Amino acid sequence: MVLESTMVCVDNSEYMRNGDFLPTRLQAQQDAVNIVCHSKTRSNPENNVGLITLANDCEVLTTLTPDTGRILSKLHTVQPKGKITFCTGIRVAHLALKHRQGKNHKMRIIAFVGSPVEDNEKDLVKLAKRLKKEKVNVDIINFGEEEVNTEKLTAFVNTLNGKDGTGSHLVTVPPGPSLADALISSPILAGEG
Template sequence: MGVESIVICVDNSEWMRNGDFIPTRLHAQQDAVNVVARFKTKENVETSIGLLTFSDTQVRVPLTTDYNKIAKSLQTVEPKGSIKFLTGIRIAHLVLKHRLNRNHRTRIIAFVASPISEDMKEMERLAKRLKKEKIHVDVVSFGEEEENIDKLSHFIETINGTEQKECHLVQARPGPMLSDILINSPIMVGEDGKPIGSGFDFSMDPMAADDPELAMALRVSLEEQRQRQDEETRRVQQESLEQMQTGEGMNQAMETEETETTDASTLPGTAEREEEDVEMQELMQNKEFLQSVLSSLPGVNPEEALQNYRR
């Protein structure tokens, strides 16, 4: 693919807490970005990569050939706010315009898993400008597809035009790992122009070979982050339980119980039982009925038993 200058834009909105990708969209994105950056830098050591976050439109890492800087910075990304797609792409464009090596091909790889609020016309204008300046854009859509599909499809089609197909929209659905989907996508192609598939030498811990200490630090950081999320989940569940046991939850339960008690006498079953009680009392006052029942009992004198009952 030649030497490139690439800005990877990642989604860090609140939507990234969603757990449809295991364990969350944020972690799935982190793994996928690691794989992409690893592949690009191993394919050509002169390729430089930068990192930008969409929510705060912050350039986390300027263009660099040091992959470890990208990996370290990814560990600090936290979900907050909402995605600012157009602003993020414009800033990535500026980063590429000021790249040191003017001979590099330019590319933006955008990860999107949040609803895009910008108007399609605004996105079209930006796409035409990127096309004019030969900025290639790949978009990885892995959430809220129904809301974004039309906008993102039109965005990529506008950049590609009719004469080129070097920009891609990859749609990923929950199930497979996001990184596995990208390995088999046009975003990651080898020298033969075909997706690399499983032929590329990836490690689940992409930094183990280069920097074992860094790899250990990242694993510890990831574990701490997951523990914080688990504690937050338990806290929310505990608060919900306490609300059910006290306050409004108890009031609602008491109101429900009073309503059920008040309405019990109007239930069809209750009326039927009252009618049955009246009929039973009338039968117990019927002498002939009692004699017929008592006479059917072995060893019982109906007259004596009836006299004892009357007493």
């Protein structure tokens, strides 16, 4: 299936600080990641993903790899109540994918929305542009307040997207459990990958 590089964007943030379904959102993020990434490395071996933190101190929380070293890396915490670096984080995740290893790997990004999502539409779409320019696959994990939607995230997946999975596919996470069951639907996983 997949030969492309991915990035995992985790907000550990006003949502992740706060359990959206067992045990915390931030924790709910975790095994969902491995779940995802497993299927990602099951999509193909060599399928690579990044992991990065934005908030008031955006940074990679592990990068490049293809196996457990992420699951290793992700193992430790983050600032739990933190804030949006998304744009920056994404813009990092973009540059991340600019160095993605052994290319012919397309660019992909997977993004947890644990933040109220402060950004501007043009910047957002400049990203979306830059992505589509860079030709990044972009799928987002969002359970926001309300959710984060009727917003950038909604325009964005559209704005990135000429072709779906060559650019963007969205899922905005709903309240309750069954994440792996939920997202089994969304083209965060399966479908076009």
